[PDB]
Short mmCIF file of C-alpha atoms and ligand atoms in Angstrom, two decimals:
data_model
loop_
_atom_site.label_atom_id
_atom_site.label_comp_id
_atom_site.label_asym_id
_atom_site.label_seq_id
_atom_site.Cartn_x
_atom_site.Cartn_y
_atom_site.Cartn_z
CA UNK T 1 47.57 31.09 61.45
CA UNK T 2 50.11 29.51 59.47
CA UNK T 3 49.98 31.55 56.72
CA UNK T 4 51.08 34.80 57.18
CA UNK T 5 53.25 33.21 59.74
CA UNK T 6 55.14 31.54 57.05
CA UNK T 7 54.42 34.98 54.49
CA UNK T 8 56.79 36.51 57.34
CA UNK T 9 59.47 33.43 57.15
CA UNK T 10 60.34 33.65 53.63
CA UNK T 11 60.39 37.22 52.81
CA UNK T 12 63.22 35.99 50.53
CA UNK T 13 60.95 34.73 47.81
CA UNK T 14 58.25 35.77 46.48
CA UNK T 15 55.51 34.06 48.06
CA UNK T 16 51.67 34.01 47.89
CA UNK T 17 48.82 32.15 49.66
CA UNK T 18 47.59 28.94 46.40
CA UNK T 19 44.38 31.54 46.34
CA UNK T 20 46.17 34.10 45.36
CA UNK T 21 45.29 35.27 41.58
CA UNK T 22 48.92 34.84 40.73
CA UNK T 23 48.39 31.63 40.70
CA UNK T 24 46.34 31.42 37.41
CA UNK T 25 49.34 31.04 34.95
CA UNK T 26 50.06 28.09 36.79
CA UNK T 27 46.83 26.06 37.18
CA UNK T 28 43.58 25.94 39.46
CA UNK T 29 42.38 25.04 42.99
CA UNK T 30 39.75 22.33 42.14
CA UNK T 31 36.87 23.49 44.60
CA UNK T 32 33.57 20.67 43.65
CA UNK T 33 35.22 17.34 44.36
CA UNK T 34 35.10 15.51 47.85
CA UNK T 35 38.25 13.53 48.32
CA UNK T 36 36.71 11.23 51.46
CA UNK T 37 38.16 7.75 50.32
CA UNK T 38 41.49 8.58 49.17
CA UNK T 39 41.96 10.81 53.02
CA UNK T 40 40.65 7.63 54.77
CA UNK T 41 43.84 5.62 53.02
CA UNK T 42 45.99 9.02 53.97
CA UNK T 43 45.43 8.70 57.51
CA UNK T 44 47.12 4.93 57.42
CA UNK T 45 50.70 6.51 56.37
CA UNK T 46 53.25 7.73 58.85
CA UNK T 47 55.61 10.68 56.67
CA UNK T 48 59.20 9.43 56.41
CA UNK T 49 61.67 12.02 58.51
CA UNK T 50 64.72 10.72 56.71
CA UNK T 51 63.69 11.52 53.22
CA UNK T 52 60.84 12.06 51.41
CA UNK T 53 58.19 9.03 49.59
CA UNK T 54 56.88 8.66 46.41
CA UNK T 55 54.78 6.28 45.29
CA UNK T 56 53.09 6.83 41.92
CA UNK T 57 50.31 4.57 41.70
CA UNK T 58 48.29 3.04 44.36
CA UNK T 59 45.18 0.19 44.22
CA UNK T 60 43.80 1.62 47.45
CA UNK T 61 43.19 5.43 46.58
CA UNK T 62 42.68 4.15 42.73
CA UNK T 63 40.33 1.45 43.68
CA UNK T 64 37.46 4.07 44.67
CA UNK T 65 34.62 6.30 43.08
CA UNK T 66 36.62 9.54 43.14
CA UNK T 67 39.25 7.69 40.53
CA UNK T 68 36.23 7.06 38.55
CA UNK T 69 34.73 10.55 38.90
CA UNK T 70 38.19 11.99 38.40
CA UNK T 71 38.98 9.59 35.09
CA UNK T 72 36.10 9.81 33.82
CA UNK T 73 35.40 14.25 33.57
CA UNK T 74 38.19 15.34 34.78
CA UNK T 75 40.94 13.60 32.69
CA UNK T 76 38.11 13.16 29.96
CA UNK T 77 38.14 9.23 29.80
CA UNK T 78 42.42 9.21 29.86
CA UNK T 79 43.71 6.91 33.22
CA UNK T 80 45.05 8.06 35.94
CA UNK T 81 46.65 6.68 38.75
CA UNK T 82 46.65 8.09 42.00
CA UNK T 83 49.35 8.13 44.43
CA UNK T 84 51.36 9.90 47.43
CA UNK T 85 54.14 12.14 48.57
CA UNK T 86 55.08 12.88 52.22
CA UNK T 87 57.99 14.23 53.95
CA UNK T 88 60.14 16.38 55.49
CA UNK T 89 61.75 18.49 52.57
CA UNK T 90 61.99 22.04 53.46
CA UNK T 91 63.43 22.73 49.88
CA UNK T 92 63.94 23.33 46.01
CA UNK T 93 66.15 20.42 45.18
CA UNK T 94 64.79 19.90 41.61
CA UNK T 95 61.42 21.14 39.56
CA UNK T 96 59.86 18.67 37.09
CA UNK T 97 57.11 18.86 34.20
CA UNK T 98 54.72 16.51 33.06
CA UNK T 99 53.14 16.68 29.70
CA UNK T 100 50.04 15.92 31.34
CA UNK T 101 48.14 18.07 34.55
CA UNK T 102 48.74 16.60 37.59
CA UNK T 103 46.42 17.45 40.76
CA UNK T 104 47.55 17.31 44.09
CA UNK T 105 45.28 17.16 46.83
CA UNK T 106 47.12 18.47 50.44
CA UNK T 107 46.53 16.22 53.00
CA UNK T 108 48.43 18.30 55.15
CA UNK T 109 48.90 22.04 55.34
CA UNK T 110 52.66 22.22 52.04
CA UNK T 111 54.03 26.00 50.38
CA UNK T 112 54.97 24.58 46.65
CA UNK T 113 57.75 25.58 44.62
CA UNK T 114 56.39 26.70 41.23
CA UNK T 115 58.26 28.37 37.89
CA UNK T 116 57.17 27.89 34.37
CA UNK T 117 58.43 25.63 32.08
CA UNK T 118 58.72 28.91 29.22
CA UNK T 119 61.74 30.45 31.31
CA UNK T 120 63.99 27.65 30.76
CA UNK T 121 66.60 28.35 28.41
CA UNK T 122 68.89 26.17 27.44
CA UNK T 123 68.45 23.00 29.86
CA UNK T 124 68.60 25.85 33.27
CA UNK T 125 65.39 27.18 35.56
CA UNK T 126 66.98 30.71 37.15
CA UNK T 127 65.86 29.66 40.84
CA UNK T 128 65.03 33.85 40.85
CA UNK T 129 62.29 32.85 38.85
CA UNK T 130 60.38 30.05 41.41
CA UNK T 131 57.18 30.83 43.01
CA UNK T 132 56.17 30.26 45.92
CA UNK T 133 52.18 29.40 47.20
CA UNK T 134 51.15 27.72 50.43
CA UNK T 135 48.98 25.03 49.98
CA UNK T 136 46.20 24.44 53.34
CA UNK T 137 45.47 21.14 54.09
CA UNK T 138 42.62 19.92 52.21
CA UNK T 139 43.29 21.90 48.61
CA UNK T 140 43.71 20.18 45.59
CA UNK T 141 44.80 22.23 42.95
CA UNK T 142 45.76 21.13 39.26
CA UNK T 143 49.79 21.69 38.37
CA UNK T 144 49.12 22.22 34.98
CA UNK T 145 51.30 20.55 31.73
CA UNK T 146 53.49 23.97 31.54
CA UNK T 147 54.32 24.21 35.59
CA UNK T 148 57.77 23.22 36.81
CA UNK T 149 57.27 21.37 40.08
CA UNK T 150 58.79 19.06 42.66
CA UNK T 151 58.16 17.54 46.10
CA UNK T 152 56.72 19.59 48.32
CA UNK T 153 58.60 21.53 50.39
CA UNK T 154 56.95 21.44 54.77
CA UNK T 155 54.36 23.78 57.00
CA UNK T 156 54.26 22.00 59.96
CA UNK T 157 57.66 20.52 61.82
CA UNK T 158 56.32 16.45 61.23
CA UNK T 159 56.16 17.19 57.43
CA UNK T 160 53.45 17.49 55.45
CA UNK T 161 51.53 14.52 53.48
CA UNK T 162 50.21 15.17 50.05
CA UNK T 163 48.04 12.49 47.32
CA UNK T 164 49.48 12.77 42.83
CA UNK T 165 47.60 12.11 40.48
CA UNK T 166 48.49 11.67 36.97
CA UNK T 167 47.73 9.69 33.58
CA UNK T 168 48.80 6.35 34.61
CA UNK T 169 52.67 5.02 34.36
CA UNK T 170 53.94 8.73 34.43
CA UNK T 171 56.84 8.47 36.77
CA UNK T 172 57.36 4.74 35.96
CA UNK T 173 61.47 4.21 34.96
CA UNK T 174 62.05 4.61 31.16
CA UNK T 175 62.09 1.10 29.16
CA UNK T 176 64.46 2.16 26.70
CA UNK T 177 67.19 4.09 26.12
CA UNK T 178 66.29 7.20 23.53
CA UNK T 179 69.33 8.27 21.26
CA UNK T 180 68.82 11.84 22.17
CA UNK T 181 68.54 14.72 19.08
CA UNK T 182 66.71 18.07 21.63
CA UNK T 183 67.39 20.29 24.02
CA UNK T 184 64.78 19.18 25.64
CA UNK T 185 65.89 14.98 25.01
CA UNK T 186 68.78 15.76 28.05
CA UNK T 187 65.56 17.18 30.96
CA UNK T 188 63.62 13.50 30.29
CA UNK T 189 64.03 11.48 33.42
CA UNK T 190 61.50 9.37 33.72
CA UNK T 191 58.09 8.53 31.91
CA UNK T 192 56.38 11.51 31.08
CA UNK T 193 58.62 13.16 33.13
CA UNK T 194 61.35 15.97 32.77
CA UNK T 195 63.65 16.91 35.09
CA UNK T 196 65.62 19.91 36.49
CA UNK T 197 67.69 19.26 38.91
CA UNK T 198 69.66 21.45 41.35
CA UNK T 199 73.87 21.02 41.19
CA UNK T 200 74.20 21.02 45.12
CA UNK T 201 71.26 17.95 45.41
CA UNK T 202 73.21 14.76 45.61
CA UNK T 203 70.64 12.95 45.29
CA UNK T 204 69.01 13.62 41.75
CA UNK T 205 72.96 14.20 40.42
CA UNK T 206 73.92 10.26 41.78
CA UNK T 207 70.75 9.27 39.44
CA UNK T 208 71.93 11.27 36.38
CA UNK T 209 69.63 14.44 36.22
CA UNK T 210 70.83 16.74 34.37
CA UNK T 211 72.23 19.84 36.31
CA UNK T 212 70.12 22.83 35.83
CA UNK T 213 68.89 24.95 37.99
CA UNK T 214 71.06 28.10 38.30
CA UNK T 215 71.44 29.99 41.40
CA UNK T 216 69.77 29.24 45.70
CA UNK T 217 68.70 25.73 46.49
CA UNK T 218 65.87 27.36 47.93
CA UNK T 219 64.77 26.75 51.65
CA UNK T 220 61.80 26.92 52.68
CA UNK T 221 61.76 28.39 56.56
CA UNK T 222 58.88 27.21 59.57
CA UNK P 1 56.94 36.64 0.84
CA UNK P 2 53.05 34.50 2.12
CA UNK P 3 53.35 35.49 5.52
CA UNK P 4 54.47 39.69 4.65
CA UNK P 5 51.59 39.21 2.63
CA UNK P 6 49.09 37.47 5.34
CA UNK P 7 49.94 39.95 8.25
CA UNK P 8 49.02 42.73 5.67
CA UNK P 9 45.51 41.05 4.53
CA UNK P 10 44.86 40.66 8.67
CA UNK P 11 45.77 43.81 10.37
CA UNK P 12 42.33 42.99 12.30
CA UNK P 13 44.35 40.02 14.49
CA UNK P 14 46.48 40.50 16.13
CA UNK P 15 49.66 38.27 13.29
CA UNK P 16 53.04 36.26 14.11
CA UNK P 17 55.39 34.62 12.23
CA UNK P 18 55.78 30.76 14.50
CA UNK P 19 59.23 31.42 14.36
CA UNK P 20 58.65 34.60 16.91
CA UNK P 21 59.40 34.47 20.01
CA UNK P 22 55.79 35.47 21.20
CA UNK P 23 54.23 31.72 19.97
CA UNK P 24 56.91 30.55 23.10
CA UNK P 25 54.62 30.88 25.79
CA UNK P 26 52.16 29.14 23.70
CA UNK P 27 54.13 26.17 22.10
CA UNK P 28 57.58 24.96 21.25
CA UNK P 29 58.73 24.63 17.56
CA UNK P 30 60.24 20.86 17.05
CA UNK P 31 63.88 21.08 15.05
CA UNK P 32 66.08 18.00 15.74
CA UNK P 33 63.57 15.22 13.93
CA UNK P 34 62.64 14.32 10.25
CA UNK P 35 59.31 13.73 9.31
CA UNK P 36 59.72 12.83 5.41
CA UNK P 37 58.29 9.36 6.03
CA UNK P 38 55.09 11.02 7.30
CA UNK P 39 55.49 14.31 4.13
CA UNK P 40 55.65 10.41 1.94
CA UNK P 41 51.92 9.25 3.09
CA UNK P 42 50.54 13.82 3.35
CA UNK P 43 51.97 13.84 -0.30
CA UNK P 44 49.86 10.89 -1.29
CA UNK P 45 46.36 13.43 -0.59
CA UNK P 46 45.03 16.26 -1.68
CA UNK P 47 43.22 18.84 -0.01
CA UNK P 48 38.81 18.56 0.39
CA UNK P 49 37.37 21.33 -0.71
CA UNK P 50 33.71 21.56 0.50
CA UNK P 51 34.98 21.66 5.23
CA UNK P 52 38.04 20.08 6.68
CA UNK P 53 39.06 16.00 7.02
CA UNK P 54 40.64 14.69 10.37
CA UNK P 55 41.76 11.31 11.37
CA UNK P 56 43.29 11.07 14.61
CA UNK P 57 44.70 7.45 13.85
CA UNK P 58 46.16 6.04 10.19
CA UNK P 59 47.86 2.75 10.90
CA UNK P 60 49.67 3.75 7.65
CA UNK P 61 51.80 6.93 9.51
CA UNK P 62 52.27 4.95 13.18
CA UNK P 63 53.75 1.70 11.63
CA UNK P 64 56.98 4.71 11.02
CA UNK P 65 60.02 5.17 13.15
CA UNK P 66 59.64 8.78 13.81
CA UNK P 67 56.37 7.77 15.14
CA UNK P 68 58.01 5.31 17.18
CA UNK P 69 60.85 7.99 17.84
CA UNK P 70 58.79 10.66 19.31
CA UNK P 71 56.43 8.10 21.61
CA UNK P 72 60.01 7.03 23.33
CA UNK P 73 61.60 10.24 23.74
CA UNK P 74 58.94 13.36 23.07
CA UNK P 75 56.37 11.90 24.76
CA UNK P 76 58.19 10.40 27.24
CA UNK P 77 57.20 6.95 26.56
CA UNK P 78 53.58 7.40 26.89
CA UNK P 79 51.56 6.07 23.76
CA UNK P 80 51.35 7.85 20.49
CA UNK P 81 48.32 8.12 17.87
CA UNK P 82 49.68 10.22 14.04
CA UNK P 83 46.65 11.72 12.08
CA UNK P 84 45.73 14.53 9.51
CA UNK P 85 43.69 18.01 10.08
CA UNK P 86 43.19 19.36 6.27
CA UNK P 87 40.56 21.53 4.26
CA UNK P 88 39.92 24.56 2.66
CA UNK P 89 38.48 26.90 6.19
CA UNK P 90 39.57 30.75 6.69
CA UNK P 91 37.50 30.82 10.16
CA UNK P 92 37.98 30.27 14.02
CA UNK P 93 34.75 28.26 14.65
CA UNK P 94 35.86 26.93 17.84
CA UNK P 95 38.96 26.79 20.62
CA UNK P 96 39.73 23.44 22.08
CA UNK P 97 42.18 21.88 24.36
CA UNK P 98 43.64 18.49 25.85
CA UNK P 99 45.56 17.98 29.07
CA UNK P 100 48.50 17.12 26.95
CA UNK P 101 50.81 18.25 24.22
CA UNK P 102 50.56 18.33 20.70
CA UNK P 103 52.22 18.00 17.60
CA UNK P 104 51.30 19.12 14.36
CA UNK P 105 53.55 19.33 11.53
CA UNK P 106 52.46 22.15 8.37
CA UNK P 107 51.99 20.15 5.40
CA UNK P 108 51.58 23.63 3.52
CA UNK P 109 51.69 26.96 4.68
CA UNK P 110 48.85 27.76 7.58
CA UNK P 111 47.92 29.60 10.20
CA UNK P 112 46.71 28.61 13.70
CA UNK P 113 44.45 31.00 16.25
CA UNK P 114 45.23 30.03 19.02
CA UNK P 115 44.64 31.38 22.72
CA UNK P 116 45.33 30.39 26.49
CA UNK P 117 43.40 28.26 28.92
CA UNK P 118 44.13 30.92 31.67
CA UNK P 119 42.09 33.69 29.84
CA UNK P 120 38.66 31.38 30.03
CA UNK P 121 36.88 33.62 32.48
CA UNK P 122 32.94 31.26 33.51
CA UNK P 123 33.06 28.72 30.20
CA UNK P 124 33.51 32.57 28.22
CA UNK P 125 36.50 32.87 25.44
CA UNK P 126 37.34 36.10 24.06
CA UNK P 127 38.01 36.36 20.09
CA UNK P 128 39.59 39.87 20.90
CA UNK P 129 42.54 37.63 23.12
CA UNK P 130 42.97 35.46 20.66
CA UNK P 131 46.47 35.23 18.10
CA UNK P 132 47.23 33.91 14.88
CA UNK P 133 49.98 33.16 14.07
CA UNK P 134 51.49 31.80 10.78
CA UNK P 135 52.71 28.39 9.94
CA UNK P 136 55.47 27.41 7.22
CA UNK P 137 55.13 24.16 5.48
CA UNK P 138 57.61 22.09 6.99
CA UNK P 139 57.53 23.85 10.25
CA UNK P 140 56.55 21.25 13.29
CA UNK P 141 55.61 22.85 16.37
CA UNK P 142 54.18 21.68 19.39
CA UNK P 143 51.11 23.29 21.16
CA UNK P 144 51.49 23.31 25.13
CA UNK P 145 48.05 21.86 27.04
CA UNK P 146 47.30 25.38 28.14
CA UNK P 147 46.99 26.64 24.36
CA UNK P 148 43.64 27.07 23.26
CA UNK P 149 43.76 25.70 19.24
CA UNK P 150 41.75 24.53 16.69
CA UNK P 151 41.80 23.09 13.19
CA UNK P 152 44.34 25.26 11.03
CA UNK P 153 42.84 28.18 8.66
CA UNK P 154 44.36 28.44 4.58
CA UNK P 155 47.38 30.43 3.61
CA UNK P 156 47.09 29.47 0.05
CA UNK P 157 43.30 28.92 -2.31
CA UNK P 158 44.03 25.56 -2.51
CA UNK P 159 43.57 24.61 1.56
CA UNK P 160 45.85 23.59 4.50
CA UNK P 161 47.63 19.53 4.72
CA UNK P 162 48.81 19.17 8.73
CA UNK P 163 50.07 16.04 10.78
CA UNK P 164 47.73 15.61 13.74
CA UNK P 165 49.50 13.20 17.20
CA UNK P 166 48.37 12.98 19.77
CA UNK P 167 48.17 10.90 22.67
CA UNK P 168 46.75 8.15 21.75
CA UNK P 169 42.70 8.40 22.54
CA UNK P 170 42.31 11.44 22.36
CA UNK P 171 39.72 12.83 20.01
CA UNK P 172 38.17 9.10 19.85
CA UNK P 173 33.88 9.83 21.35
CA UNK P 174 32.92 9.88 24.95
CA UNK P 175 31.87 6.53 26.47
CA UNK P 176 29.96 8.05 29.56
CA UNK P 177 27.67 10.65 30.33
CA UNK P 178 29.29 12.13 32.81
CA UNK P 179 27.48 14.20 35.91
CA UNK P 180 28.08 17.96 35.48
CA UNK P 181 29.74 19.54 38.31
CA UNK P 182 33.27 22.14 37.31
CA UNK P 183 32.68 24.98 34.97
CA UNK P 184 34.66 22.34 32.52
CA UNK P 185 32.96 19.42 32.64
CA UNK P 186 30.43 21.69 30.10
CA UNK P 187 33.38 21.76 27.99
CA UNK P 188 34.40 18.23 28.14
CA UNK P 189 33.56 17.00 24.07
CA UNK P 190 35.72 14.22 22.94
CA UNK P 191 38.06 11.98 24.96
CA UNK P 192 41.06 14.15 26.55
CA UNK P 193 39.29 16.98 24.15
CA UNK P 194 37.67 20.16 26.03
CA UNK P 195 36.05 22.73 23.43
CA UNK P 196 34.65 26.04 23.12
CA UNK P 197 32.24 26.79 20.36
CA UNK P 198 31.83 29.79 18.59
CA UNK P 199 28.24 30.87 18.66
CA UNK P 200 27.22 30.02 15.53
CA UNK P 201 29.45 27.27 14.02
CA UNK P 202 26.37 24.44 13.92
CA UNK P 203 28.55 22.39 13.12
CA UNK P 204 29.83 21.60 16.35
CA UNK P 205 26.94 23.05 18.12
CA UNK P 206 24.65 20.09 17.29
CA UNK P 207 27.53 17.58 18.32
CA UNK P 208 26.72 18.60 22.16
CA UNK P 209 29.57 21.38 21.96
CA UNK P 210 29.55 24.06 24.42
CA UNK P 211 28.85 28.03 23.23
CA UNK P 212 31.37 30.01 24.28
CA UNK P 213 33.80 32.48 21.85
CA UNK P 214 32.15 35.77 22.38
CA UNK P 215 32.54 38.56 19.80
CA UNK P 216 33.69 37.74 16.21
CA UNK P 217 34.19 34.16 14.12
CA UNK P 218 37.12 35.70 13.12
CA UNK P 219 38.19 35.35 9.49
CA UNK P 220 41.82 34.45 8.41
CA UNK P 221 42.21 36.46 4.88
CA UNK P 222 44.31 35.30 1.97
CL1 CL K 301 51.43 28.04 30.37
FE1 FE K 302 54.96 16.18 39.20
FE1 FE K 303 43.48 19.75 19.08
NA1 NA K 304 34.54 24.34 38.75
NA1 NA K 305 28.64 19.45 25.92
#
């Protein structure tokens, strides 16, 4: 099916299924929960064709039995938000991390281009360290805090839909302009979000993102 | 030198300095902040001789410039608490993680026994996967969310003192009794804290901890 097709089209990058043991360094597949209340909301959305969209916190999705289950158990009673990231993207563009776990639920098939925070050296990450993981429709994953990640890359021509679950407030605008002291301070970009942008990605550079991906702006062919 | 003395006494454990590059898999050494406000408070304490003490949130230590600096920059605007863990312990006892970053600042020399969350299999962690890191007085470290850790082990006969900084609420008592569904739900122990206890530690098992460390309850000799 789509997995083998995509693997064949992407021999320029290491390209694995999300169920591969290689994913274990980056996160965990979550199997025990069902997400019908969230799927219902996501069915009412359209995928944008001009650029990706991200909404960090959606009342409809947070006002659900499943959000309470995930807050009290998966996040150990820390307050969460549930949003979405949908779009037409096929390129790496940037890599971010949070000092928290993220859940991504694939509402369509999609690909995640991932890295490790430990592979950042002096605010540079090399494209040649990226690994791609094919995530089938319906699979939920935890991305660990040490996993660099960004918007998905599409599998179907029509683009992708994903649910994104984070501690409440993550990705909100910064309310203060810190006096930068550490290397990582150069990467802080939104609340609980550190970002390394590809220099060829003008949409990020124009917002003041730190240019730090060295290498190709990887494309996922489909 | 205390480091080489301790390394020589602990050849049964892989034993490294916190400045060793191996620690970069588990966290980061924090170098550009000034913790003098907190050091002043910690100098006013002695070390308990009978058992460890952990106080999660100390108002005086949170009403500091450093607290604001670390909240707005290191934690990217997410609310934090500042407390301490001091005591006479020399054994592994347990291994915990949070889905957040922790800062430990060594007020005395101390040793951290660490593991990786990805090395847990069916809620078991093997003692032979533990690594020890010697942390000199004055060093501050970030422990990543994927780093299993617990209370320090002492270097000096008098015990150790450490500052512990976490997202606000971490380690509070759980307010809900979840339906257990995932393996990790068996480990949830306090707010934002999952614990794998050594089966010999009744102090932990009696409080509801999951016995899951297979192997010796490692002792750090000094
Ligand atoms: Cl990791
Ligand atoms: Fe993210
Ligand atoms: Fe901890
Ligand atoms: Na499970
Ligand atoms: Na329990």
